Amino acid sequence: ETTALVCDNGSGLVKAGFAGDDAPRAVFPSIVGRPRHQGVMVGMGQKDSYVGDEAQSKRGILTLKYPIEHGIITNWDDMEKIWHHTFYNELRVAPEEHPTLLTEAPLNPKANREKMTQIMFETFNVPAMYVAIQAVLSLYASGRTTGIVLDSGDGVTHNVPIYEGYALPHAIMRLDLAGRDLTDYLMKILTERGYSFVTTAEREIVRDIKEKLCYVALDFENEMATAASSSSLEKSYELPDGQVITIGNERFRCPETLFQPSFIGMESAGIHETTYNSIMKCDIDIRKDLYANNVMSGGTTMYPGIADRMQKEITALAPSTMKIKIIAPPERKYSVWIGGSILASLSTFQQMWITKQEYDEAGPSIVHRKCF
Amino acid sequence: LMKILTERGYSFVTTAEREIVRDIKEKLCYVALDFENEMATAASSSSLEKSYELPDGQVITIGNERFRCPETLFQPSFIGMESAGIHETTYNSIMKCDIDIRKDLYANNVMSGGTTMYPGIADRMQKEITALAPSTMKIKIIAPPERKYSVWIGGSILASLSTFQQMWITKQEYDEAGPSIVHRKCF
Amino acid sequence: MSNTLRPYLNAVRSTLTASLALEEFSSEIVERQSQPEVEVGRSPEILLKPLVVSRNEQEQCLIESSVNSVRFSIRIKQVDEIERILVRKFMQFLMGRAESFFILRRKPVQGYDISFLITNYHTEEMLKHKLVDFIIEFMEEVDAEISEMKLFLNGRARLVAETYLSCF
Amino acid sequence: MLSLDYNNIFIYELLTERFSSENPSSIDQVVTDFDGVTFHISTPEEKTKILISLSMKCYPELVNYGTLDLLKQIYGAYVHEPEMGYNFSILIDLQQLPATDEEKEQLAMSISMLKRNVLAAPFHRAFTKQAELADLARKDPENAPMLDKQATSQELMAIHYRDEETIVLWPEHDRVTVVFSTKFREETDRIFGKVFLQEFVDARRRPAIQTAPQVLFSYRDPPLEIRDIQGIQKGDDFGFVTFVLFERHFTPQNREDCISHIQVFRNTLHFHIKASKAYMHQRMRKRVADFQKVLNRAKPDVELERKTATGRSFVRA
Numbered sequence A: 001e002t003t004a005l006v007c008d009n010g011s012g013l014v015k016a017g018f019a020g021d022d023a024p025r026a027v028f029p030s031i032v033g034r035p036r037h038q039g040v041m042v043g044m045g046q047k048d049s050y051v052g053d054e055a056q057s058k059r060g061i062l063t064l065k066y067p068i069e070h071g072i073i074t075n076w077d078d079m080e081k082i083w084h085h086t087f088y089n090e091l092r093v094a095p096e097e098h099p100t101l102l103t104e105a106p107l108n109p110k111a112n113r114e115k116m117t118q119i120m121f122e123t124f125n126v127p128a129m130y131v132a133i134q135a136v137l138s139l140y141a142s143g144r145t146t147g148i149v150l151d152s153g154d155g156v157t158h159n160v161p162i163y164e165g166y167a168l169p170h171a172i173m174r175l176d177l178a179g180r181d182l183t184d185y186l187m188k189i190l191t192e193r194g195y196s197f198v199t200t201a202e203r204e205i206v207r208d209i210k211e212k213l214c215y216v217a218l219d220f221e222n223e224m225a226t227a228a229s230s231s232s233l234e235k236s237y238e239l240p241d242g243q244v245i246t247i248g249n250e251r252f253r254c255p256e257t258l259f260q261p262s263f264i265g266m267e268s269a270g271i272h273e274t275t276y277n278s279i280m281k282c283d284i285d286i287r288k289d290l291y292a293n294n295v296m297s298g299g300t301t302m303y304p305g306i307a308d309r310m311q312k313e314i315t316a317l318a319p320s321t322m323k324i325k326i327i328a329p330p331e332r333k334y335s336v337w338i339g340g341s342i343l344a345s346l347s348t349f350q351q352m353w354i355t356k357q358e359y360d361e362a363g364p365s366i367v368h369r370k371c372f
Numbered sequence B: 001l002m003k004i005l006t007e008r009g010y011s012f013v014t015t016a017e018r019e020i021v022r023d024i025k026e027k028l029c030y031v032a033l034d035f036e037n038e039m040a041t042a043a044s045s046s047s048l049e050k051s052y053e054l055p056d057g058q059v060i061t062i063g064n065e066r067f068r069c070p071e072t073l074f075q076p077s078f079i080g081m082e083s084a085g086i087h088e089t090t091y092n093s094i095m096k097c098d099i100d101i102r103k104d105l106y107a108n109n110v111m112s113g114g115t116t117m118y119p120g121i122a123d124r125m126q127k128e129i130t131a132l133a134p135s136t137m138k139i140k141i142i143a144p145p146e147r148k149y150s151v152w153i154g155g156s157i158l159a160s161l162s163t164f165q166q167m168w169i170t171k172q173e174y175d176e177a178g179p180s181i182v183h184r185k186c187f
Numbered sequence C: 001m002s003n004t005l006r007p008y009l010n011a012v013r014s015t016l017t018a019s020l021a022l023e024e025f026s027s028e029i030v031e032r033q034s035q036p037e038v039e040v041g042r043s044p045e046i047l048l049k050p051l052v053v054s055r056n057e058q059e060q061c062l063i064e065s066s067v068n069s070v071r072f073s074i075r076i077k078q079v080d081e082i083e084r085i086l087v088r089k090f091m092q093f094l095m096g097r098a099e100s101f102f103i104l105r106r107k108p109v110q111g112y113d114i115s116f117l118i119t120n121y122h123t124e125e126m127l128k129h130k131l132v133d134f135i136i137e138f139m140e141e142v143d144a145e146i147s148e149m150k151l152f153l154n155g156r157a158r159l160v161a162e163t164y165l166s167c168f
Numbered sequence D: 001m002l003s004l005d006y007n008n009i010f011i012y013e014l015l016t017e018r019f020s021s022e023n024p025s026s027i028d029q030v031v032t033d034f035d036g037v038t039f040h041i042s043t044p045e046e047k048t049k050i051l052i053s054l055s056m057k058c059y060p061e062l063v064n065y066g067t068l069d070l071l072k073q074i075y076g077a078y079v080h081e082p083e084m085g086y087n088f089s090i091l092i093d094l095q096q097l098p099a100t101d102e103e104k105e106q107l108a109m110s111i112s113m114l115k116r117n118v119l120a121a122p123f124h125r126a127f128t129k130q131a132e133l134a135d136l137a138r139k140d141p142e143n144a145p146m147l148d149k150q151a152t153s154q155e156l157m158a159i160h161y162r163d164e165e166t167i168v169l170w171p172e173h174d175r176v177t178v179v180f181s182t183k184f185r186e187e188t189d190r191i192f193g194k195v196f197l198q199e200f201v202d203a204r205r206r207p208a209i210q211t212a213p214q215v216l217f218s219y220r221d222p223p224l225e226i227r228d229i230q231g232i233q234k235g236d237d238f239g240f241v242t243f244v245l246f247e248r249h250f251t252p253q254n255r256e257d258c259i260s261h262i263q264v265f266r267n268t269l270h271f272h273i274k275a276s277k278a279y280m281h282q283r284m285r286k287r288v289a290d291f292q293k294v295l296n297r298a299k300p301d302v303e304l305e306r307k308t309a310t311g312r313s314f315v316r317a
């Protein structure tokens, strides 16, 4: 075999390519959209469903539905459509001639893993496949071997402490607040200034607004007090309609939902308190090293100044005698992919696949007892 | 139990979910006599899947999770905690005790507390304790049905006892030594 | 599709475009009549040698040429028997409407599933520098269709199962 | 249609027509149904008297299960001695039907629904046994497991209505579990049924429909309780779908619908396999049309003069 397939079927974005490469050959939004009108025109090549970049481009006359919700696939038809798109329309490689690598968030239902493995083995007839966790991939990408990984993405945020070559499954904390919830909160709090966003196209526009403008402050009370004298903090954005909107304290308010989950009415610890609890749940002799190795990964952690604020809160929580260091590579958006490719391009990994001859002799439950 | 309910697909995060899961453990969870045999039985889970009617009216069904969570007592390694099970803990406690009364303590094994109300815990723990101990003496387990409030019953018996009134702590008797007066005579 | 079938696809393209140097020729055994010489095979002095292109044991491209007619039969991948049934039914529908295709046979040669047959007249009137384009386009799109239709089977099975089970 | 009907439509229509009519006519038609069941309708004695007969290969097992009494208290005094070559017979005379229209309609529906009416005897017996064990266990919680085991042993009931099908049902203190020994001949039928059964299992799992009875399917091996049961081959080619019906699934307001549904299951699966075949046919042609569109290149532009309509240009210029 020359190269092996690998696909990061994330909740919001999907990353695909070949093992060993240092650049995603294909990244498109994980969106499947259906038309919602008549089409009095003639011809035009009426296509029943547009997926990916085509749906993102033609969202004007489509209704978009995300197949993956909170890290759990809910529309298996759309998931199969997206996998078919990745296999044939963009990477355009035969699935039957390439082992593939998949990624699934920790603590997901076993139904998700079993169904995904069965679909890949039977409907696509891949030679071999493997399922890996995001945190292990982040550690592989960063080159480390010890350090709790904060993986905040579009669907779910989870923490998996991992000592040197060993993971503590009992200290894994998973939080269901992520980029989609942040976008929903931004939509809700942009209404107080007049602008209203309802349809899925408006949801994508608000996602772009959060992309281009949202950032995390350092001290919430001081930032709000500064925003009270609203002089040199507001910005402006250009909708495709051409209308210009102004953003204010809600530019930085909605990122704070990560640290104060009570903003969206959920009783849970913030992304710093959950990390502190996850570290404290581990053995005492490894906390002194897990503190020094805080790993930031995922798309959500791309906010400006999030790392500094998280370091400040963790330093405040932890005792002062032991230093706190947080690391976030500039390419952390694709850290999960980079780790996946590094793992898939390892000689010692060749015997850890799940071949079809191995799968059909044990049923779809083999993934539970081999992959993890 | 909350951690292991997730793999079935259900989600419980808030403290209301905590109370709901506590009620689920109240009504459904039981202890398996043989872990491997019951896992093999649950592989063909024909008659080991009860259904709990949630307050929201949406029912949930749990299979091997019924008996997987109570075995944490016997196998504390499930939650990552490094310790022996309760059976071997009791065996070690009896062994470290002096020899002349080990036989007596083997025949008197009182069960008390709310957690010991799992259906069939007495039988499994009796079997495992007998396996750990030598076979030359007999071992029995006492599991009264009232063991939920056995602590209160003992407290009431002690309070109503005729000579206990001299063991009290009078306010004046507390006044001299302050808060530390309790330590010298309470226990 | 492509980015995946470069060498096999280009070999088929080159062989087909080389083998399409047809010519008007009558019948050497029947007077005032002209027939496709590849199908009859009665005069061997005008039949070029049969040619085969392959990429794997399950994919073949039998290229039989002649002075006027060329027959080109291919095999497409059928990894699992689901794809076997899907391919058989789809290719049957494809050949069932050969009247409007002009380069199809209503029945493929044995051991195959489709057989094109480009007689002289098609090169005479229809410009032939895109007949091969249609050939390769079909050879990749057909696997695309088989995958998509098996996805649709799975989807409909899921839908009917849910519809049946929800009404308890 | 998505859901198969629960009775014989021909019997319903015939009964409605003959009840609403004024001049009856002699009829003699034998009608077949799903799963090999056959119905015979005739008027041998009087033009106003109609006799309807039922044919079923497994009927003696139903008699063993206690179905004669259920049929008796279902159909009242209408019971008549069975005819030759048939199992259960009913004779109806139009001069004694209730005058009210709704009574006539419900009688016609009940007679047309004879299939599940005769097949539901094991289900009713299992429900009664489940109620008995439920009250007995409510009498003393500590007495559950041994009575549950003895009910799984003794009350384990079974029936063979097709030669590649089997229902195995048994009650408990809280549930009535049922096992279907599904198997499809006619290779392509089994080929599509593999996918159908796999997707049918997943369904239940989805949190969207958790209220449904729990499903359990595992081919090449039967459950623990039915390996020793006669008639169950050691996983030659037979699947085994198992439904666990809890107390809430047969509440006194939902027993009959559940019975009819669980009975019609296999026929629904078969009919929907055929429907999927038709779905392929239509999609496959629908976009081989797109392939023809792709081919329609390589045709230089030409002009047809008029070709007006149902003719040839209808003019010389």
Ligand SMILES: Nc1ncnc2c1ncn2[C@@H]1O[C@H](COP(=O)(O)OP(=O)(O)O)[C@@H](O)[C@H]1O
Pocket: A008, A009, A010, A011, A012, A013, A014, A152, A153, A154, A155, A179, A180, A207, A210, A211, A214, A298, A299, A300, A302, A303, A336
């Ligand atoms: N620079 C950025 N600033 C703010 N938010 C971002 C940025 N980049 C990505 N995001 C958010 O992160 C999400 C990307 O999710 P992703 O990390 O791809 O999920 P997964 O890890 O499951 O693949 C997007 O939905 C987007 O809202």
Ligand SMILES: [Mg+2]
Pocket: A010, A011, A134, A153, A154, A298, A336
């Ligand atoms: Mg991710």
